[PDB]
Design a protein around this ligand. Structure first.
Ligand code: 456
Length: 843
């Protein structure tokens, strides 16, 4: 069951999709997979330390960087502790444990077992890790801040309670019968054919077509299409891709071998996805839910079972050549035959693996078996250091083999939760490339989220973002989400509920406001009136008392600071919202700022931001900090989501719009003044000059690499404290934004050098060749990003921007001399493209 059906209505509304719905399935893969996941769920729900789960201590094994060791000169660290408006400070050793610190303290208050929380956050200092290795702590030191902690009692784990569960030698051939569309697009008598491809990692094995016929709402062929491939030569996760041309209009897929290892038989009526204008949506096994409008196709299958010596110098060297090669450098057939013939040697190089597995005739069963026997003797892989780049490459769209893919996931098992989070978004996107719903990766995500509430929390928002936005992959993800929610345990189930209500109310209000101010760049007085009046109407009796901040889940937002809420001056109309802090133990009257925006696809932003955090950990590996500000951003629904407001920041634009703000005129000395008036000490000023030379530099390198470098002044921001950063990534050229305003902070004005600019060029180039040491990682992440994240994109040229950007094939010399001249454009062009945004207002 009676109540067991509410739970299911509870799940469905937290998901935003009904997994019990079967109107859009031509088999039971989804149901079977809802079934399959219970165990890995129940297994992980069975095996998690209830208290450690409840406190989700956030923590790393990485060393502390050179830079933050320079921040400590006593081998000793200060921590302020409070109980109830009593508070004292303790000199602690960087290697001290939490429990070990309770010893130095049960020494104090009085002259049972309690826990240390961060003041203001649902964030705890527990577990047998040294304080140096909690992430909050490294965070405090970086920004120059005290460590404040309250002694309370731990969260009862009975709040994590989980509801009790209740579970041939023939050639291949396919009868195409015809297609039907109800209403016809273009109407002038055109010409139309079907194309049917047998696929495996975009590797096309065989292809057949039809005779073309007149494109009328119904087109009937009734033809057998006999392929070259043999039934016994079909591989698992091979797709029957079916496409319609006149050129490409619609596409649809059918897994030829089903999730039971069963060849696929019978009649199918497939509703087809329509093209807009390669792309992960193209790969999907899902069918178009919109049956009323969509093109569809009828087919039939009547087709049961199935489940050394020493190499010469000059070839080794071709092989090593091949292997050295970047991910996107394609293999000649010469290349591939080499790789294969010498597969056992190729096996001793883990860098080879992607290249080697894309040198497999997956359309011969004989070869696949040899390939599986290859995968048997996996000593060398099994024992290699985890290379995420490498590992990820084996998860992309090029690899549709269950067992190749599965070796990559074996490697991920060894990631700590710290890193799981780094790549979590990209791993979640990688599911799009899994041929089946139920996959080792899916399972790995499921597992790891249930294991740790932080990962679980982000996993939720990531899956939900996609479910709500993408029809191609919402069924699959919805099944993985349900699986998660079923184990995350009631505490979280309530948190998610709080959150989902709030963000649904606030998007109502976001969109209603765009209706009102049409475009008219001004926000009428009446617009804020109503904005104000609604938020009063919303808190009244409806909104949650409080709630976790999806982008920063340690933070429980309280009530709204309605006085300070507003709408922004955009052509879009984003909401500027500020909330009180629900935690009354917190340190500040500083509100929680959140912007709500409809108008740009924010998945794209999420992806860039993540890559930014990765670049930042890469610089952590050379003891480098470049002070990037990858503020929080969460896609929640359709071209809509939320954003962290970064306190005490303005637009480079508005800094020009201060003294001038004209019809578009710029001045050089003005940034540097803005900083002086916001630096109560002259040190603090040069420290802002400081943070800026870094932030500026880092943002110069990263932006060039991704190719999002020619940006307006308006979409770059700086803090009152010197931290510059780009924003709004949903939105003569120039490689990046290094304006003349910037360089004058570096003691220079177009065509000279200085103490702080030599330093700028120093970091830049170091930063640049540091990323180049992780070239293949960035290539793979960017490539994947594009495929899962974007519009359409050319599966050569778009993808291939970044390898000329990272100046592949070159030496730290040539490469620096590449990047250095990229600077000496922004010195030639100065204002000239900055200048340009506006002029095109009419061009
Ligand atoms: C126009 O909508 C978009 C889209 N993407 C990002 C973005 N910014 C994100 C970070 C950010 N911090 C601010 N702090 C202050 C004090 O104004 S304002 C802002 C807006 N704004």
């Amino acid at each position: 069951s009676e109540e067991s059906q509410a739970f299911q209505r509870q799940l469905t509304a937290l998901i935003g999709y009904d997994v019990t719905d079967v109107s859009n399935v031509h088999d039971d893969e989804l149901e079977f997979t809802r079934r399959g996941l219970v165990t890995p769920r129940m297994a992980e729900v069975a095996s998690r330390d209830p208290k450690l789960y409840a406190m989700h201590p956030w923590v790393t094994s990485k060393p502390l960087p050179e830079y933050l060791w320079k921040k400590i000169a006593n081998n000793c660290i200060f921590i302020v502790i409070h109980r109830s408006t009593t508070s004292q400070t303790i000199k602690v050793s960087p290697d001290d444990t939490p429990g070990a610190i309770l010893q130095s303290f049960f020494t104090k208050m009085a002259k049972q077992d309690f826990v240390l929380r961060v003041c203001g956050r649902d964030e705890y200092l527990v577990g047998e890790t040294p304080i140096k290795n909690f992430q909050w702590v490294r965070h405090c030191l970086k920004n120059g801040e005290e460590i404040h902690v309250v002694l309370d009692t731990p969260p009862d784990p009975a709040l994590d309670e989980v509801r009790k569960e209740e579970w041939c030698d023939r050639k291949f051939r396919v009868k195409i019968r015809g297609i039907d569309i109800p209403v016809l697009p273009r109407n002038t008598d055109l010409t139309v054919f079907v194309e049917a491809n047998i696929q495996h990692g975009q590797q096309v094995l065989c292809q057949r077509r039809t005779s073309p016929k007149p494109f009328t709402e119904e087109v009937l062929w009734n033809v057998w299409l006999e392929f070259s491939i043999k039934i016994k030569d079909l591989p698992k996760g091979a797709l029957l891709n079916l496409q319609i041309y006149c050129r490409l209009l619609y596409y649809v897929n059918l897994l030829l071998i089903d999730h039971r290892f069963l060849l696929r038989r019978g009649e199918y009526v497939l509703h087809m996805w329509q093209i807009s204008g390669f792309n992960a949506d193209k790969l999907t096994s899902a069918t178009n839910p919109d049956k009323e409008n969509s093109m569809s196709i009828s087919i039939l299958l009547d087709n049961h079972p199935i489940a050394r010596a020493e190499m010469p110098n000059q070839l080794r060297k071709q092989l090593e050549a091949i292997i050295a090669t970047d991910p996107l450098n394609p293999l000649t057939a010469e290349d591939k035959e080499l790789l294969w013939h010498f597969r056992y040697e190729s096996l001793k190089h883990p860098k080879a693996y992607p290249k080697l597995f894309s040198s497999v005739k997956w359309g011969q069963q004989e070869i696949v078996a040899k390939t599986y026997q290859l995968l048997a003797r996996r000593e060398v892989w099994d024992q290699s250091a985890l290379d995420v780049g490498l590992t990820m490459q084996l998860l992309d769209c090029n690899f549709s083999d269950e067992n190749v893919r599965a070796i990559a996931v074996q490697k991920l098992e060894s990631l700590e939760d710290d890193d799981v989070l780094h790549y979590l978004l990209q791993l979640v996107q990688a599911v799009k490339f899994e041929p089946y719903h139920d996959s080792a990766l899916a399972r790995f995500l499921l597992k790891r989220g249930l294991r740790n509430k932080r990962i679980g929390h982000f996993l939720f928002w990531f899956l939900r973002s996609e479910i709500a936005q993408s029809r191609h992959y919402q069924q699959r993800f919805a099944v993985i989400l349900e699986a998660y929610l079923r184990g995350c345990g009631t505490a979280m189930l309530h948190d998610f509920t709080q959150q989902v209500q709030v963000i649904e109310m606030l998007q109502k209000v976001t969109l209603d406001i765009k209706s009102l101010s049409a475009e008219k760049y001004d926000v009428s007085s009446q617009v804020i009136s109503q904005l104000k009046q609604k938020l009063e109407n919303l808190q009244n009796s409806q909104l949650p008392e409080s709630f976790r901040v999806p982008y920063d889940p340690g933070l429980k937002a309280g009530a709204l600071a309605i006085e300070k809420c507003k709408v922004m001056a955009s052509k879009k109309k984003p909401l500027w919202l500020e909330f009180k802090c629900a935690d009354p133990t917190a340190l500040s009257n500083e509100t929680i700022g959140i912007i709500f925006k409809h108008g740009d696809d924010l998945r794209q932003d999420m992806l860039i931001l993540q890559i930014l955090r990765i670049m930042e950990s890469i610089w952590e590996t050379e003891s480098l900090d470049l002070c990037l500000l990858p503020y929080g951003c969460i896609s929640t629904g359709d071209k809509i989501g939320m954003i962290e407001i970064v306190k005490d920041a303005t637009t480079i634009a508005k800094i020009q719009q201060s003294t001038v703000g004209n019809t578009g005129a710029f001045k050089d000395e003005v940034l540097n003044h803005w900083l002086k008036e916001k630096s109560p000490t002259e040190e603090k000023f040069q420290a802002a000059v400081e943070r800026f030379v870094y932030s500026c530099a880092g943002y110069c390198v990263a932006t060039f690499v991704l190719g999002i470098g020619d940006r307006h002044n308006d979409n770059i921001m700086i803090t009152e404290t010197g931290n510059l950063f780009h924003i709004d990534f949903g939105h003569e050229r120039v490689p990046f934004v290094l304006t003349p305003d910037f360089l004058f902070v570096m003691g220079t004005s177009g065509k000279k050098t200085s103490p702080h600019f030599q330093k700028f060029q120093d970091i830049c180039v170091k930063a640049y060749l540091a990323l180049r040491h992780h070239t293949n990682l960035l290539i793979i992440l960017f490539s994947m990003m594009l495929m899962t994240g974007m519009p359409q994109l050319t599966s050569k040229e778009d993808i291939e921007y970044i390898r000329d950007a990272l100046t592949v094939g070159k030496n730290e010399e040539d490469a620096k001399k590449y990047f250095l001249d990229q600077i000496e454009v922004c010195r030639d062009k100065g204002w000239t493209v900055q200048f340009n945004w506006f002029l095109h207002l009419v061009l």
